[PDB]
Amino acid sequence: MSITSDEVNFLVYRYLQESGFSHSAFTFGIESHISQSNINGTLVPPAALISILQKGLQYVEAEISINE
Amino acid sequence: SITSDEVNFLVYRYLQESGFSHSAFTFGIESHISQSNINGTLVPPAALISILQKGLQYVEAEIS
Amino acid sequence: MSITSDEVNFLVYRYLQESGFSHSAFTFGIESHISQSNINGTLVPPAALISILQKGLQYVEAEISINE
């Protein structure tokens, strides 16, 4: 399920916004050229970066536990 | 379950490694990225990306 | 009437704030170490940078006009 640069940038950008990192969000939106990203912001849920990251951890725990 | 500081360091490292100098600078401060208790040594390059990769594999396992 | 680095930094910082340059103000406050400046913000009037700059221009106009 290959992930693109623009995707992670969107997840990060939205994380900065939601966490109240107003100044970082602004700076990152520009540096990452987020305006030029082809992603629909309205279809991205809140805490998305937090959610995937949480699942990423659990997935790795599952890989170790079966071979544990 | 991950914590705010852990997530913050992940995005912070990503920002540095991705060459987002000005974002890295501003976010280091706004986060108070230290003052927090994380050892940079135990977090490898692309860790944010890597954990996200495993997270999409998990989501692809839930719709299956 | 010698002017110091911290002084001009304060004038600029306050200009960014007042003009609504929220993100610049934040970034500059940090870069210029404005927290470490020995200046009393409460005794600095609004549009101070704009005012001095305006007077700076008028002063130069006066220097040219008498020799004009």
Added chain:
Amino acid sequence: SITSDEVNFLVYRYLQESGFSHSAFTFGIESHISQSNINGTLVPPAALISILQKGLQYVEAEIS
């Protein structure tokens, strides 16, 4: 009488010349420092400082 864009370019140039990289970057955007109609050539280094210097001489002439 000076204009918003003129003041903005002055502070912008000052930010660059003073090595405030991250401020210069953020302020270039937030200002929309161009999109505005100023020729960099006709504005010398330290122009912000210089005009401020003359402004304090003027204020010192008013209390006198």
